[PDB]
Coordinates of C-alpha atoms and ligand atoms in Angstrom, one line a residue:
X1 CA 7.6 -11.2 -10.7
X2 CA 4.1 -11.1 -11.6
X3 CA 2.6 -13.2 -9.3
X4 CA 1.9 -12.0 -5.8
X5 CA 2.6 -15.8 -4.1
X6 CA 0.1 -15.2 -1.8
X7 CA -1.9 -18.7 -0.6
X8 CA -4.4 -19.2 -3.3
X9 CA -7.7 -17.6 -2.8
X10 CA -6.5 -14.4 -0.9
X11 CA -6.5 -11.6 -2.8
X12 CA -5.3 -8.2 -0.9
X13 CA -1.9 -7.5 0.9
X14 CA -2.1 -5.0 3.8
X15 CA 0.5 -2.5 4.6
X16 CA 1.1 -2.4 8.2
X17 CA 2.6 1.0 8.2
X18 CA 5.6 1.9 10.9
X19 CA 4.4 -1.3 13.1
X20 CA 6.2 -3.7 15.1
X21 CA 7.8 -7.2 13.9
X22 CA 6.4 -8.8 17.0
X23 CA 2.8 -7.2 16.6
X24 CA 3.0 -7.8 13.0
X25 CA 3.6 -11.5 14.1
X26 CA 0.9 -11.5 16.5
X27 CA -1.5 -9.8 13.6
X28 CA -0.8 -12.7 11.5
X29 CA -1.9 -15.3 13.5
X30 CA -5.2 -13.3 15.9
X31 CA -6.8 -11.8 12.9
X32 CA -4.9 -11.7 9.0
X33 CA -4.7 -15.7 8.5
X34 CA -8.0 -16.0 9.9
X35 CA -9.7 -13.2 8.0
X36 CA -8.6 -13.9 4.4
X37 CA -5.5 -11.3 4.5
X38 CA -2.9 -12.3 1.3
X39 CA 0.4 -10.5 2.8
X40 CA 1.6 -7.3 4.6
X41 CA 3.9 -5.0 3.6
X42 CA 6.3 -4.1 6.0
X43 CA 8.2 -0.8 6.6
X44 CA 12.1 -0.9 5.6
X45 CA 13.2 -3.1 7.6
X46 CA 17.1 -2.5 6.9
X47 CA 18.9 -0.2 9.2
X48 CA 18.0 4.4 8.9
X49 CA 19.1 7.5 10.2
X50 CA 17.9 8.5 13.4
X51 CA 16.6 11.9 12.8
X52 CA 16.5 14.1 16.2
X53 CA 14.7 17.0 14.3
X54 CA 12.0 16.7 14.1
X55 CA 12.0 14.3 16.2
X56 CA 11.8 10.6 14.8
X57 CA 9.8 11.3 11.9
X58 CA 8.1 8.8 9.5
X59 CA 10.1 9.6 6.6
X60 CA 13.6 8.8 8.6
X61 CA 13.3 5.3 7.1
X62 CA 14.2 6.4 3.7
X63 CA 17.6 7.3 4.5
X64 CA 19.4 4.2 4.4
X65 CA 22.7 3.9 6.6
X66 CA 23.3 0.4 6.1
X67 CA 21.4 -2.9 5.3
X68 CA 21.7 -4.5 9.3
X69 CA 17.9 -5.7 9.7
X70 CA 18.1 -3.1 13.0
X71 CA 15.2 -0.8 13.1
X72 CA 12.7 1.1 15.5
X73 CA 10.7 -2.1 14.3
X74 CA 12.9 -4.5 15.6
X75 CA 16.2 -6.0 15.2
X76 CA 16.7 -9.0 12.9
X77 CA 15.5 -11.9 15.1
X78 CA 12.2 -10.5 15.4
X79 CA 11.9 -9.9 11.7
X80 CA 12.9 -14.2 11.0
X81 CA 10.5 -14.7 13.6
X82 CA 7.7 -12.7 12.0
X83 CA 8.3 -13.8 8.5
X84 CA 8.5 -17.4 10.0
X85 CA 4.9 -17.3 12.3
X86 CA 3.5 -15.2 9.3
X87 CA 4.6 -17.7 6.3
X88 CA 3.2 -20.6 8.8
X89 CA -0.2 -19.6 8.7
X90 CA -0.1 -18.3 4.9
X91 CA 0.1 -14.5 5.2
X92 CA 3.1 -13.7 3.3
X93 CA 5.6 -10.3 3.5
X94 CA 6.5 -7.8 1.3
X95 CA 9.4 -6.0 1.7
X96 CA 9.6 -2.1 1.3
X97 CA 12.8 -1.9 -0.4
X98 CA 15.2 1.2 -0.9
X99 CA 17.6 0.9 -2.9
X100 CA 18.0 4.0 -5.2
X101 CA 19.8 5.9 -2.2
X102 CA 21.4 6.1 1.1
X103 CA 21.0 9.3 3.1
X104 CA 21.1 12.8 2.6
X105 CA 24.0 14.1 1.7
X106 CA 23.7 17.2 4.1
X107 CA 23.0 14.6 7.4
X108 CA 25.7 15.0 9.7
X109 CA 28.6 12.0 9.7
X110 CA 28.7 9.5 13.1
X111 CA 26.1 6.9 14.2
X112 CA 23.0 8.7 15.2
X113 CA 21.4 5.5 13.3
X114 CA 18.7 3.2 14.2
X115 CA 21.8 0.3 14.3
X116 CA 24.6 2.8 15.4
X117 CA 26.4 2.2 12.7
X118 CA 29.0 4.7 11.3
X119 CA 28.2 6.6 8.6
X120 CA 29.7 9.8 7.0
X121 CA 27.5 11.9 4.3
X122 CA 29.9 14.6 3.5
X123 CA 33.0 11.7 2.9
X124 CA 30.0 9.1 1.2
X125 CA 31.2 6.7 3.4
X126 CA 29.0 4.6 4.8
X127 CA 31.5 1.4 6.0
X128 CA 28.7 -0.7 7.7
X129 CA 27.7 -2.2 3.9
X130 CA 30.9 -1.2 2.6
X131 CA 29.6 1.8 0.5
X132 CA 32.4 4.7 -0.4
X133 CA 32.3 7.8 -3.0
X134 CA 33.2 5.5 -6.1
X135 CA 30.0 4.2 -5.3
X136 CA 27.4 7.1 -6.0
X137 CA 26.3 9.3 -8.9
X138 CA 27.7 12.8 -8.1
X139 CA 30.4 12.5 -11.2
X140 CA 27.0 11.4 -13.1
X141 CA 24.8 13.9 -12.3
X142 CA 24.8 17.2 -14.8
X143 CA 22.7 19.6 -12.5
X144 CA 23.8 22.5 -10.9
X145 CA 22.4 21.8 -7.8
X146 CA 23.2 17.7 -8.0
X147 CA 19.5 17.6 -7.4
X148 CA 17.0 16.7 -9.5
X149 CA 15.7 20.0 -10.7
X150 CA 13.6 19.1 -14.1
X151 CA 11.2 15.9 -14.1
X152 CA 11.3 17.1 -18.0
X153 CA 14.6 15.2 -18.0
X154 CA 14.6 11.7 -17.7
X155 CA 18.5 11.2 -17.2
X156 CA 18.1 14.0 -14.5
X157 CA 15.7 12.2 -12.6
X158 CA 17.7 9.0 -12.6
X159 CA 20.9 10.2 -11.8
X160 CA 20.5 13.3 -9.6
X161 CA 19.4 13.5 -6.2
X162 CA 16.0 13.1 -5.2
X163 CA 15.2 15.8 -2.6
X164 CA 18.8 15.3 -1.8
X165 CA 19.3 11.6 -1.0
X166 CA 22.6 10.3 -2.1
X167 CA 22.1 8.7 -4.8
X168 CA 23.7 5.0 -5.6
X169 CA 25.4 4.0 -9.2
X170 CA 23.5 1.2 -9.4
X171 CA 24.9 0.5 -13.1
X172 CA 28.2 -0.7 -11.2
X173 CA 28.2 -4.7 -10.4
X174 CA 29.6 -4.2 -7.0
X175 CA 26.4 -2.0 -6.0
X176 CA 24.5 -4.2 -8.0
X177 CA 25.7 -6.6 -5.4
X178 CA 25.5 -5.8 -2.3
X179 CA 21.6 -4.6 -2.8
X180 CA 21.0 -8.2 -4.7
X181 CA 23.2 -9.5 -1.3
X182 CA 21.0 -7.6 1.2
X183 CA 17.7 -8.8 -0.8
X184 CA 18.9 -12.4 -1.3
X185 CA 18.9 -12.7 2.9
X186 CA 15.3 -11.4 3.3
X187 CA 14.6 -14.1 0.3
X188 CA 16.0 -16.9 2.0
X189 CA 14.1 -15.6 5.6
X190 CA 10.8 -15.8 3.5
X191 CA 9.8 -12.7 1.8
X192 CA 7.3 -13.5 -0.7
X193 CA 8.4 -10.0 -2.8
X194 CA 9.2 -6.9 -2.8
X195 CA 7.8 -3.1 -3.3
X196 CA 10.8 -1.4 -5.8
X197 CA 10.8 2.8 -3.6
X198 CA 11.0 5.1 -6.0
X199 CA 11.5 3.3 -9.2
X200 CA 11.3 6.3 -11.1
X201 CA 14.3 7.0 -10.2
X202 CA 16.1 4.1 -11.3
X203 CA 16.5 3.0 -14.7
X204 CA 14.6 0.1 -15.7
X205 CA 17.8 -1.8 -17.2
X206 CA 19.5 -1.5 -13.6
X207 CA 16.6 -2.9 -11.7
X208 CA 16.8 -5.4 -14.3
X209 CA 20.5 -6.3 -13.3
X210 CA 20.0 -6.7 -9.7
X211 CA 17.0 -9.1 -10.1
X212 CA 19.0 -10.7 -12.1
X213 CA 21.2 -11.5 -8.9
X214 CA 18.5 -13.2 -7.3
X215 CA 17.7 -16.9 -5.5
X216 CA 14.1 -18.3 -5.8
X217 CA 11.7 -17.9 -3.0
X218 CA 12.3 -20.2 -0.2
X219 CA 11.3 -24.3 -0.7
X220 CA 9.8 -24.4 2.4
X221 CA 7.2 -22.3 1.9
X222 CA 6.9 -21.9 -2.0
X223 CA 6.5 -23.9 -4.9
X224 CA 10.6 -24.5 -6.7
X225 CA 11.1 -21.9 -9.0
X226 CA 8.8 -19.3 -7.6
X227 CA 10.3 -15.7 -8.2
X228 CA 9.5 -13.1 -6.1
X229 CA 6.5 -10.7 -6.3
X230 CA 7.7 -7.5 -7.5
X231 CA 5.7 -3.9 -7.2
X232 CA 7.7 -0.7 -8.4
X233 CA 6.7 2.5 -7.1
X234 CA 6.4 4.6 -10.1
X235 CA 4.1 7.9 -9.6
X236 CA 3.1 8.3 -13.4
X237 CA -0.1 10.6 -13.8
X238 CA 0.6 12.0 -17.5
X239 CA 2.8 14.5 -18.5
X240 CA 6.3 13.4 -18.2
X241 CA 9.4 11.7 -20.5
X242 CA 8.9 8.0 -18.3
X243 CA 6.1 6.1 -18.5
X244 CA 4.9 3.3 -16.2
X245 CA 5.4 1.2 -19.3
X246 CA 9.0 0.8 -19.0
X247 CA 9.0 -1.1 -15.8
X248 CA 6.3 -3.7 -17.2
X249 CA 9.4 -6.2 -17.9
X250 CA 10.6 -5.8 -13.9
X251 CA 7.1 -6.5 -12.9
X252 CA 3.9 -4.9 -11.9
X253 CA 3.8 -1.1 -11.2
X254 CA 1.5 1.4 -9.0
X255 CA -1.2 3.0 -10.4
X256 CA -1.1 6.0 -8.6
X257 CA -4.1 7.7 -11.0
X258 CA -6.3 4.8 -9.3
X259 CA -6.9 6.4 -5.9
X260 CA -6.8 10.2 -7.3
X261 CA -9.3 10.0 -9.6
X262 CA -11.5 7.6 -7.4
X263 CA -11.6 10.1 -4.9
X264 CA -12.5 13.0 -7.3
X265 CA -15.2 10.5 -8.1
X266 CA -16.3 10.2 -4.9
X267 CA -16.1 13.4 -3.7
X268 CA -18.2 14.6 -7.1
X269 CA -15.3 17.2 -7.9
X270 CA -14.9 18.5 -11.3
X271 CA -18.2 17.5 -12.2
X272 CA -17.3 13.4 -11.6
X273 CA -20.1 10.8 -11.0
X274 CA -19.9 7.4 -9.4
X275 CA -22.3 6.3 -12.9
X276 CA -19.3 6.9 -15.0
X277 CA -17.3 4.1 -13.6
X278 CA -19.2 1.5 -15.5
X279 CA -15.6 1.4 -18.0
X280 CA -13.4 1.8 -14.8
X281 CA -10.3 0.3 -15.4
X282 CA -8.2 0.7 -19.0
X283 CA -10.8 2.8 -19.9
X284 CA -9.7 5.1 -17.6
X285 CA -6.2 5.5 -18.8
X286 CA -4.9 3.2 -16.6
X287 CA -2.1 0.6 -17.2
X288 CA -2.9 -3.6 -18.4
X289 CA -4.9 -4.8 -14.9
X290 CA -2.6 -7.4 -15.4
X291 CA 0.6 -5.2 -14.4
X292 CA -1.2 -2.9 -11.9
X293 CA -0.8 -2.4 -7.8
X294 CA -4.2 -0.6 -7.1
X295 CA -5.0 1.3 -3.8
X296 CA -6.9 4.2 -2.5
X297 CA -4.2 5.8 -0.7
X298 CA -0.6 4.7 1.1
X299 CA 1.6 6.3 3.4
X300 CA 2.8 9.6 1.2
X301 CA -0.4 11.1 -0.2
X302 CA -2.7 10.2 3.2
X303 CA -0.5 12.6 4.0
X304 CA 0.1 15.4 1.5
X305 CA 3.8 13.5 0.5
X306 CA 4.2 11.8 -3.2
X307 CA 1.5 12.5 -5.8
X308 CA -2.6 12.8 -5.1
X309 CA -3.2 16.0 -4.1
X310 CA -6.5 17.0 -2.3
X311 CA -8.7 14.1 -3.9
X312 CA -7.2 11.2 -2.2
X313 CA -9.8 10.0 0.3
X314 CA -8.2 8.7 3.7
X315 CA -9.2 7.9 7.2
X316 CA -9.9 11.1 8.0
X317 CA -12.8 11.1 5.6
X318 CA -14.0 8.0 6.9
X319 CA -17.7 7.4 5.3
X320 CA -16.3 8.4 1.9
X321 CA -13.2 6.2 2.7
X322 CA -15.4 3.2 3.6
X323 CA -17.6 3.7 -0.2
X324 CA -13.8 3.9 -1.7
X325 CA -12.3 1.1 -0.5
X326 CA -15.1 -0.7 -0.8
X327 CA -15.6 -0.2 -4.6
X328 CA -11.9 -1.2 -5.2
X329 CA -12.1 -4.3 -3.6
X330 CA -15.5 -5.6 -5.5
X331 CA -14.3 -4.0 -9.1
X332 CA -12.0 -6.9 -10.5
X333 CA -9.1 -4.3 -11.8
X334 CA -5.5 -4.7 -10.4
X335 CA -4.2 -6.4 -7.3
X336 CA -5.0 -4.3 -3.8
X337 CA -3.7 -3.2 -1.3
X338 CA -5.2 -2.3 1.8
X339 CA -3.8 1.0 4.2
X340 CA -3.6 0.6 7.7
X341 CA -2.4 4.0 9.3
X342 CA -1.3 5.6 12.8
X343 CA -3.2 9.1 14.2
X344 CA -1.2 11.9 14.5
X345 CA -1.8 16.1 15.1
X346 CA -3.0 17.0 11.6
X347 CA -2.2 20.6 11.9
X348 CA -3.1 22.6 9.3
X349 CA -1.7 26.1 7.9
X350 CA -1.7 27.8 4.8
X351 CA -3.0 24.9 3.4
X352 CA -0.5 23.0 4.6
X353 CA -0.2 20.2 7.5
X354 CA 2.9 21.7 9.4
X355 CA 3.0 17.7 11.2
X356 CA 2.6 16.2 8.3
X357 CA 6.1 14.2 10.0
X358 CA 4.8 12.9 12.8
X359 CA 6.1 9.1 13.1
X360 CA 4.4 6.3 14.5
X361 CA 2.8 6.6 17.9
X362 CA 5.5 6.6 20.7
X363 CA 7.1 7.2 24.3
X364 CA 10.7 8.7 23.7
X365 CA 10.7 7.2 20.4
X366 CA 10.0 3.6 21.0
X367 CA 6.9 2.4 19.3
X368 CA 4.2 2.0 21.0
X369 CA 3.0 -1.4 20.8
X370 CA -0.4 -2.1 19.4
X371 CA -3.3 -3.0 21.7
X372 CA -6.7 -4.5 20.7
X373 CA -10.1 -3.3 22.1
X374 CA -12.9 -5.6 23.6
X375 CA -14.3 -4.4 20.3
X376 CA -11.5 -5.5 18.2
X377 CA -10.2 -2.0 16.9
X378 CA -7.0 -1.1 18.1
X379 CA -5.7 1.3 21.3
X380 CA -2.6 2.9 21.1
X381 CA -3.2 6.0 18.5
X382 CA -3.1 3.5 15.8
X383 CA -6.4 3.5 13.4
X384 CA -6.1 -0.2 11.8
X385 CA -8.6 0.6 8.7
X386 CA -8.0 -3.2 8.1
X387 CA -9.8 -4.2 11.2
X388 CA -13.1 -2.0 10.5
X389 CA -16.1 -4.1 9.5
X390 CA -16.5 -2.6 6.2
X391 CA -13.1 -2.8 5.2
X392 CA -12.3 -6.0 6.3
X393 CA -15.6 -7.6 5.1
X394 CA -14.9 -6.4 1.7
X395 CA -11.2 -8.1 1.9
X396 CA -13.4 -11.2 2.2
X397 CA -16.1 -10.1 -0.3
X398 CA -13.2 -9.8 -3.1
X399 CA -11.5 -13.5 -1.9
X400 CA -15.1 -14.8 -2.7
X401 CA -15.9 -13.3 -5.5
X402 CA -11.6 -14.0 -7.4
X403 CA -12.2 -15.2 -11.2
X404 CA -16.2 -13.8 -11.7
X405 CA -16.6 -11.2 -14.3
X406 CA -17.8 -7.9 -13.7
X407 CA -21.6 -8.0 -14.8
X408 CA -25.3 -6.4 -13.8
X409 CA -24.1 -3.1 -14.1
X410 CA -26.6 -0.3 -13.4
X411 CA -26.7 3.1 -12.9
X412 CA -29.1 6.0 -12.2
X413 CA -27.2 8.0 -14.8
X414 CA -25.9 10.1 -11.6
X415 CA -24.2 8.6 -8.3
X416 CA -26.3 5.4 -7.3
X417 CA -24.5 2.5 -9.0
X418 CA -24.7 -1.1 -8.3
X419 CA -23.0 -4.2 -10.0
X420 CA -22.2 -7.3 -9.6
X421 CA -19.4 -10.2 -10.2
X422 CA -20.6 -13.7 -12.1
X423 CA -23.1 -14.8 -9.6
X424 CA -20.9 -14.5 -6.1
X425 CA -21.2 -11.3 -4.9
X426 CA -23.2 -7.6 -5.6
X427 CA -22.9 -4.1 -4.3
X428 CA -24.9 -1.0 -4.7
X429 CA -23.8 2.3 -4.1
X430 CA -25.9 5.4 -2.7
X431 CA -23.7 8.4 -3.1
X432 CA -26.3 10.8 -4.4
X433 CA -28.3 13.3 -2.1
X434 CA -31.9 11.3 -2.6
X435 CA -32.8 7.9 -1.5
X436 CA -32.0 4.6 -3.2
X437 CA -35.1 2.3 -3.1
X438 CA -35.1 -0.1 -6.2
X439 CA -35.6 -3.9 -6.8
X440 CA -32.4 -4.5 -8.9
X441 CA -30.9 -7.9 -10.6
X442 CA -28.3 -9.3 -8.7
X443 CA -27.4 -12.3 -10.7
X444 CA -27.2 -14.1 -7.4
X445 CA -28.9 -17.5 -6.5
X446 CA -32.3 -17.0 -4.4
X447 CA -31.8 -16.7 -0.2
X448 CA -31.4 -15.1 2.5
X449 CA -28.4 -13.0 2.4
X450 CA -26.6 -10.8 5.4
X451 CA -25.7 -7.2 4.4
X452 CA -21.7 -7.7 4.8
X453 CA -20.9 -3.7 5.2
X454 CA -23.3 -3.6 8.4
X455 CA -23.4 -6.3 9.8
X456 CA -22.5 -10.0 9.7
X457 CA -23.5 -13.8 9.1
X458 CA -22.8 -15.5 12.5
X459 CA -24.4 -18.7 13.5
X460 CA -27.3 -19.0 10.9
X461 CA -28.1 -15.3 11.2
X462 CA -27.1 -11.7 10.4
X463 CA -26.3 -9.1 12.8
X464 CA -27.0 -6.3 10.2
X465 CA -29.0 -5.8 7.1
X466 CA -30.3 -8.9 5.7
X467 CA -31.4 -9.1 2.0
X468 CA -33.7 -11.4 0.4
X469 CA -32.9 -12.5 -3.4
X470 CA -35.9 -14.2 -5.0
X471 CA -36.0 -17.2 -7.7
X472 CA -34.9 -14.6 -10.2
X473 CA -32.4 -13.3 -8.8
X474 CA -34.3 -10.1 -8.2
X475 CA -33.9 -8.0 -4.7
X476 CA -35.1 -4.9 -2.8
X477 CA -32.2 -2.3 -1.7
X478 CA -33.3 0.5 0.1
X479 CA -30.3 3.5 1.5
X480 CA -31.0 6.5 2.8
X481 CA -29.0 9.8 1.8
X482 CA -27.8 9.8 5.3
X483 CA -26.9 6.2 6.0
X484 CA -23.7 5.6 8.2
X485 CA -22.7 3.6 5.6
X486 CA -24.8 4.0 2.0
X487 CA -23.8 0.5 0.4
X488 CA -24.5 -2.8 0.6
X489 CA -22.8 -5.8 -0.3
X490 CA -23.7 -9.5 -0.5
X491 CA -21.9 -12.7 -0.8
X492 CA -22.2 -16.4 -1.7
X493 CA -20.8 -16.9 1.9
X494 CA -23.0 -14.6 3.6
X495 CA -25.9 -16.1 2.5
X496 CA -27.7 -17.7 5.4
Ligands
LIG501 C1 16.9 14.6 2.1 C2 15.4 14.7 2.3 O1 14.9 13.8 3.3 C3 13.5 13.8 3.5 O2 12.8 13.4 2.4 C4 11.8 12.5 2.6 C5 10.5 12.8 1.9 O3 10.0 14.1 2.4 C6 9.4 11.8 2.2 O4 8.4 11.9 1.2 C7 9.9 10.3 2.3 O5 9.6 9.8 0.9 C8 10.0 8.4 0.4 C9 11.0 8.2 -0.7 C10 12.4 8.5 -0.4 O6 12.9 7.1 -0.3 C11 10.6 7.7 -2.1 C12 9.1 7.4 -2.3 N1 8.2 8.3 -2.8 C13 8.7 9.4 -3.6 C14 8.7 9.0 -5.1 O7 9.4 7.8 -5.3 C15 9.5 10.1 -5.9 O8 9.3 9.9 -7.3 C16 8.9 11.5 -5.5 O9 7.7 11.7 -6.2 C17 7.6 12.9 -7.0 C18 7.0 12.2 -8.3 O10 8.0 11.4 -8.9 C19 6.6 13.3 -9.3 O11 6.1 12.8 -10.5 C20 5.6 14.1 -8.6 O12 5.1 15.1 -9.4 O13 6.1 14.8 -7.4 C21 6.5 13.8 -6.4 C22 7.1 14.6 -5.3 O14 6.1 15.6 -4.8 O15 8.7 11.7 -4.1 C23 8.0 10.7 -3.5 C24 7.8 11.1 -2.0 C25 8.7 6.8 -0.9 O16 7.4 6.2 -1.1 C26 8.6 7.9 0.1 O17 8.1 7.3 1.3 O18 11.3 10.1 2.5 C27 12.2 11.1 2.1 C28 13.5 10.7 2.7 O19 13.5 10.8 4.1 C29 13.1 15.2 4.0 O20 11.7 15.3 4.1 C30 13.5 16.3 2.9 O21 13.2 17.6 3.3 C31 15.0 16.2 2.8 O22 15.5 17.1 1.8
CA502 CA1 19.0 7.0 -9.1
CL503 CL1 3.6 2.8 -2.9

């Protein structure tokens, strides 16, 4: 469950937050296959509550009402057609899959659902799967509230309520079931894997049990006895009685202390500097690279939601964003994953974005479709980080690069950094407020190399930055303090 099964040499997986099956389709084919892209994660695409207020909001899609493939995404045609185009030109999909709840239990009953199924949260019955109140952990959980009220107690956070949601017995075989059912048809459609939602809140022995329940990835597309890629969200910063540790046998987890302390890094809070990154990785704290989801930031924290805080660099902060994601794709820790995010009304009071809710962009709640530029970023309200030059280029800098060991470190001893991996790629770094002029070691063979991050190599020339390596490997990098953009990277495929 390792193994993200993504077509070998492509190394990222995007997550295509709140789009489309048919754009995601369309985005396979126009611009992920042909620009290195490993997979996408997808939104749930099983059937939620429709939530009237607020209206529609992002976070609607975590309250289960059935597992129907009937969502403000599409219904379940357009999801076997998008896994199908998608798997045909090697971009794989990842499933966002809840399964540690239904809804919350103080939703009113009836079919204000994405499907219009029934459902009743006050009885527990939600007949479209069949679920009933045998079925869920209120006789189970020991809290006054039957929420989860101390993180301190690990049995509390597994069998209470999170924030409410009606929480599933998944000890019992017949839940067990019908989640390793629901799963086992998006295996057989073409789903390369899965990210676990909010592992933490399941025991690792359950998630166990109902992996047990399931088939091989499909023939068609994937060598026999592939097993599905499996990511579990588990938001472990220290302090508390689970440790990412325990999911290692499921498979990999998120390593949510990643993109916070990048950012504080970055953002040269509590007195951080980019030159102590030279041990990033386990020396950090973090979990084996070998068992780690990396990213800057995903759909919770970009947001305020889940764990991060102020640190976590997003969109917003675009020219810090750019140096961010940047750096994780050329450091060789973890598998990546790349955000792609929608605009909305950041609104901000107390401290606190009161639209921090806002769903996808929208007319009367259906999803606005996405629409490409003449310049190739998207219309529509929709930011697709993963089409921005810098970004993308990097996607393609780390594909390159897959298997070289991080060498040629140097640093300034404050924030100008640069490093290289085996003799494929090299970066520098300029986040300090003085110019970077220096002829550094690149470890890279002698040529003519195009400046990936502003510009790039098209038809025997560069439309950016172009860098000459000599015979020994030796170049000239100059950034300015108050460069668009202060890094540069160069590839053994942008060499001219
Ligand atoms: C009944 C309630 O419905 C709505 O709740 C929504 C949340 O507001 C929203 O974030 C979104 O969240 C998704 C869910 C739910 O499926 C789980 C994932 N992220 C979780 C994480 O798994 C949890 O563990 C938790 O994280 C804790 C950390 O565990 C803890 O260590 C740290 O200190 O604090 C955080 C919480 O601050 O919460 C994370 C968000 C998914 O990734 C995430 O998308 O969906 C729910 C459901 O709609 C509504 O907003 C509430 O008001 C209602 O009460
Ligand atoms: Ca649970
Ligand atoms: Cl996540």
């Amino acid at each position: 469950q390792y193994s993200p099964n993504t077509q070998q040499g492509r190394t990222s997986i995007v997550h295509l937050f709140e789009w489309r099956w048919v754009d995601i389709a369309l985005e396979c084919e126009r611009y992920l296959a042909p620009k290195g892209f490993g997979g996408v994660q997808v939104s749930p695409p099983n059937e939620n509550v429709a939530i009237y207020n607020p209206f529609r909001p992002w976070w609607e899609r975590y309250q289960p009402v059935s597992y129907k493939l009937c969502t403000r995404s599409g219904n379940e045609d357009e999801f076997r057609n998008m896994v199908t185009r998608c798997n045909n030109v090697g971009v794989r999909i990842y499933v966002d899959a809840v399964i540690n709840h239904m809804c919350g239990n103080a939703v009113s009953a009836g079919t204000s659902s994405t499907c219009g199924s029934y459902f009743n949260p006050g009885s527990r019955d939600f007949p479209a799967v069949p679920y009933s109140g045998w079925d869920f952990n209120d006789g189970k959980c020991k809290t006054g509230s039957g929420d989860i009220e101390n993180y301190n107690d690990a049995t509390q956070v597994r069998d209470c309520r999170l924030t409410g949601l009606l929480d599933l017995a998944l000890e019992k075989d017949y839940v067990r079931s019908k989640i390793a059912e629901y799963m086992n048809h998006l295996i057989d459609i073409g789903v390369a894997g899965f990210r676990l939602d909010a592992s933490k809140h399941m025991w690792p022995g359950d998630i166990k049990a109902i992996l047990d329940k399931l088939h091989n990835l499909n023939s068609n597309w994937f060598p026999a006895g592939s097993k599905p890629f499996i990511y579990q969200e588990v938001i472990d910063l220290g302090g508390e009685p689970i440790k990412s540790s325990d999911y290692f046998g499921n498979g990999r987890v998120t390593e949510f202390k990643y993109g916070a302390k990048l950012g504080t890094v970055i953002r040269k809070w509590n007195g951080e500097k980019m030159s102590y990154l030279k041990n990033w990785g386990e020396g950090w704290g973090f979990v084996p690279s070998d068992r780690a989801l990396v990213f800057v930031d995903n759909h919770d924290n970009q947001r305020g939601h889940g764990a991060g805080g102020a640190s976590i660099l997003t969109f917003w902060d675009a020219r810090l964003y750019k140096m961010a994601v940047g750096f994780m794709l050329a450091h060789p820790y973890g598998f990546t994953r790349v955000m792609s995010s929608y605009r909305w009304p950041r609104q901000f009071q107390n401290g606190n974005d009161v639209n921090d809710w806002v769903g996808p962009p929208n007319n009367n709640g259906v999803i606005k479709e996405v629409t490409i530029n003449p310049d190739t970023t998207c219309g529509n309200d929709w930011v697709c980080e993963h089409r921005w030059r810098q970004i993308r280029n990097m996607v393609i800098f780390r594909n390159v690069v897959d298997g070289q060991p991080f060498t040629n470190w140097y640093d300034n001893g404050s924030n100008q950094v640069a490093f290289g991996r085996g003799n494929r790629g090299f970066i520098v770094f300029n986040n300090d407020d003085w110019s970077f002029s220096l002829t550094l070691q690149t470890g890279l063979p002698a040529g003519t190399y195009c400046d990936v991050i502003s510009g790039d190599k098209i038809n025997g020339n560069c439309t950016g930055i172009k860098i000459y390596v000599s015979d020994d490997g030796k170049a000239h990098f100059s950034i300015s303090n108050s460069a668009e953009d202060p890094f540069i990277a160069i590839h053994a495929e942008s060499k001219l």
